[PDB]
């Protein structure tokens, strides 16, 4: 219902149509992340690094515990939350707190193994309880780089290297678990960020937990797999995190259409239409979509939320075959698409690029009246555009070239120029208002 043929005359050539997907129905998996390595094999060399590291780690961790206790103290046995005590909170925070309280059963079950959790010296261990996987930070580095050379190097270099490693790990961790994270009660934190505790390789975490699907990569890349912190221990220095595995559910009667832009010629100038590239047609209701937060694959578009945004009535009126309402922007740069191929036909502003056929050896020319030139079998089979030769047919109107259409007014999309345009516009409006008042 977009009248693609009329849009193609102003450089908006129909592109690839994709389906729309959104996450739903997560599955929960608990995992412990021990934040302090075990150095029982090389304790002769620790010195005072461990004390300072523990002090700094406790300083980092305590605010998280203080924030979580706010929602753990009040919630009582469904589940009733005392609104008075909480005071101020949004809906997402309330839902996250409800989930956190619901997770307390598994949190206690995991905590029952506190003695065994603290006494693990390995990168990844499996403790039977259902089984729970205990990870460790820097325990692989200590095991395979420092312990082997305990006898080759002095106990002053080992201590210094361990201190440097701990400091670097803390520096990396502070970016995520520092003062920036002030909303622990929320399930919108991606596993990629949460993996900074273990060292930055979320692949090991996901493989250990166990992912069962073929589209796992698409879920992972679009920030659709998130985790939550359900318990923090200030004594053994470990946090239990719950990972959510959702499933993509394609939405029905909804698809995203992409429009490839092209620069057309008018009044001896190259212009580009200013129209959104991605259009979300859902239930025959056109609207915009925020693509910055949405992953784009070859056959579909995946988002973790519904990003549809209202679109101004003028845009919807224009996309439905009314080119008078679509603005244009002048082109001064020399690097802008000048031709585009769709469905086998070639739409190309044929004045700027030396477009010239091959079979008959003549040249393809366009008069100043035309905006874009369409080339297909009828004109001639093979087209020699610049330095590339190319070889279909057009299923639309037969007399596409000699039609002509009205075009809209120009605009400027520079960030600074918006303010100047608004100010001058107002200046003009005020003058007209004063003139009307005078007479």
């Amino acid at each position: 219902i977009l009248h693609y043929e009329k849009l193609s005359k102003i450089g908006l050539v129909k592109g690839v149509t994709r389906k729309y997907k959104i996450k739903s129905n997560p599955l929960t998996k608990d995992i412990v992340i021990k934040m302090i390595p075990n150095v029982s094999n090389m304790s002769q060399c620790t010195g005072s690094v461990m004390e300072n590291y523990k002090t700094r780690l406790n300083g980092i961790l305590t605010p998280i515990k203080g924030a979580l206790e706010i929602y753990k103290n009040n919630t009582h046995d469904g589940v009733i939350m005392a609104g008075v005590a909480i005071g101020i909170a949004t809906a997402a925070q309330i839902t996250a707190g409800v989930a956190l309280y619901e997770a307390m059963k598994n949190a206690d079950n995991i905590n029952k193994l506190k003695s065994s959790i603290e006494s693990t010296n390995e990168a990844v261990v499996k403790l039977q309880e259902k089984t729970v996987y205990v990870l460790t930070a820097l325990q692989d580095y200590i095991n395979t780089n420092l312990v082997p050379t305990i006898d080759k190097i002095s106990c002053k270099q080992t201590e210094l290297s361990l201190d440097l490693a701990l400091s670097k790990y803390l520096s990396d961790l502070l970016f995520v678990f520092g003062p920036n994270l002030q909303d622990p009660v929320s399930n919108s934190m991606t596993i990629q960020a949460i993996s900074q505790a273990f060292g930055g390789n979320y692949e090991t975490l996901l493989r250990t937990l166990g992912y069962a699907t073929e589209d796992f990569d698409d879920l992972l890349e679009s920030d659709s797999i998130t985790g939550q912190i359900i318990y923090v221990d200030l004594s053994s220095y470990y946090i239990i995190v719950r990972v959510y595995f959702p499933i993509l559910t394609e939405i029905q009667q909804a698809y995203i259409q992409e429009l490839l832009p092209v620069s057309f010629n008018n009044d001896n100038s190259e212009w580009i239409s200013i129209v959104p590239n991605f259009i979300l047609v859902r239930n025959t209701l056109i609207s915009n979509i925020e693509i910055g937060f949405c992953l784009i694959t070859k056959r579909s578009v995946i988002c973790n939320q519904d990003y549809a945004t209202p679109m101004t009535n003028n845009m919807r009126e224009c996309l439905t075959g009314s080119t008078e309402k679509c603005p244009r922007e002048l082109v001064v740069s020399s690097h802008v698409p000048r031709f585009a191929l769709s469905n086998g036909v070639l739409f190309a502003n044929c004045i700027s690029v030396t477009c010239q056929c091959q079979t008959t050896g003549r040249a393809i020319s366009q008069s100043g009246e035309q905006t874009l030139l369409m080339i297909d079998n009828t004109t001639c089979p093979t087209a020699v555009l610049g330095n590339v030769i190319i070889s279909g047919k057009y299923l639309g109107s037969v007399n596409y070239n000699s039609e002509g259409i009205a075009i809209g007014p120009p605009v400027f999309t520079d960030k600074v120029d918006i303010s100047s345009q608004i100010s001058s516009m107002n200046q003009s409006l005020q003058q007209s208002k004063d003139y009307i008042k005078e007479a």
Partner: antibody, heavy 117, light 104 residues
Framework: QSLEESGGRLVTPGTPLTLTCTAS????????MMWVRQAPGKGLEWIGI?????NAYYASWTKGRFTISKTSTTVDLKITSPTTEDTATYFC???????????????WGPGTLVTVS | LTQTPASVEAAVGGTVTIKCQAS??????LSWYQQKPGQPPKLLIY???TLESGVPSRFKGSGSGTEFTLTISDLECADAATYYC??????????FGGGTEVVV
């Protein structure tokens, strides 16, 4: 708790000799077992250490004339090609478990005088 | 790697200082012992600042790279015997130092 060690009678040069530490009251695999020597009226001298496993490191000044071994609940320092220089009161000590470095000598044995003819 | 304690102080009723310096840097790792005649040495200080449990509040020594010194604040008859300062940095080779005589 006391690292009682068997002594060694005077032996003619050129014959092997063996000493042992009859450790009791504690686990012998938890800590290193360093060996020290003191010639009469002279300063202490280091003659090697043994890891928890079977890996013993020796002093530079000894050309592999000693042998450090570990038994289930005892350690042994066998000597080869003894000479007049070997006479001393050998001591058996256990390194401090942590916080001091290698060969901290937290606890020491009574010592035994291995004289040489 | 090499030690050279030379104080041989013979003061009675007052503070006595013993000093030893390693040939090369040894970091903060060095232990001070005590050996009365006819008895095995007993650890007094390890890491050059820490006191082994049991020793009195005195026997406070300190220092830095290849320079260490132990000071016996409150001296009495019971504290008179040989003193040693062992380097305990390398696992491969740790060596003692020359004996010292307080001879109170």
């Amino acid at each position: 708790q006391s690292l009682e060690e068997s002594g060694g009678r005077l032996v003619t040069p050129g014959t092997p000799l063996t000493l042992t530490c009859t450790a009791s009251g504690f686990s012998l695999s938890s800590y290193y077992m360093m060996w020290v020597r003191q010639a009469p009226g002279k300063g202490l001298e280091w003659i090697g250490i043994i890891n928890t496993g079977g890996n013993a490191y020796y002093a530079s000044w000894t050309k592999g004339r000693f042998t450090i071994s570990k038994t289930s609940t005892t350690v042994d320092l066998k000597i080869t090609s003894p000479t007049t220089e070997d006479t001393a009161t050998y001591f058996c000590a256990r390194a401090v478990p942590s916080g001091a470095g290698y060969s901290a000598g937290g606890l020491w044995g009574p010592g035994t005088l291995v004289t040489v003819s | 790697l090499t030690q050279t304690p030379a104080s041989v102080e013979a003061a009675v009723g007052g503070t006595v200082t013993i000093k030893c310096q390693a040939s090369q840097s040894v970091g903060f790792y060095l232990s001070w012992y005590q050996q009365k005649p006819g008895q095995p040495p007993k650890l007094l200080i390890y890491r050059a600042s820490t006191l082994e449990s049991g020793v009195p509040s005195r026997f406070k020594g300190s220092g830095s790279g290849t320079e260490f010194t132990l000071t016996i604040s409150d001296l009495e008859c019971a504290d008179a015997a040989t003193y040693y300062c062992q380097t305990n940095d390398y696992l491969a080779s740790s060596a003692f130092g020359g004996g010292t005589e307080v001879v109170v």
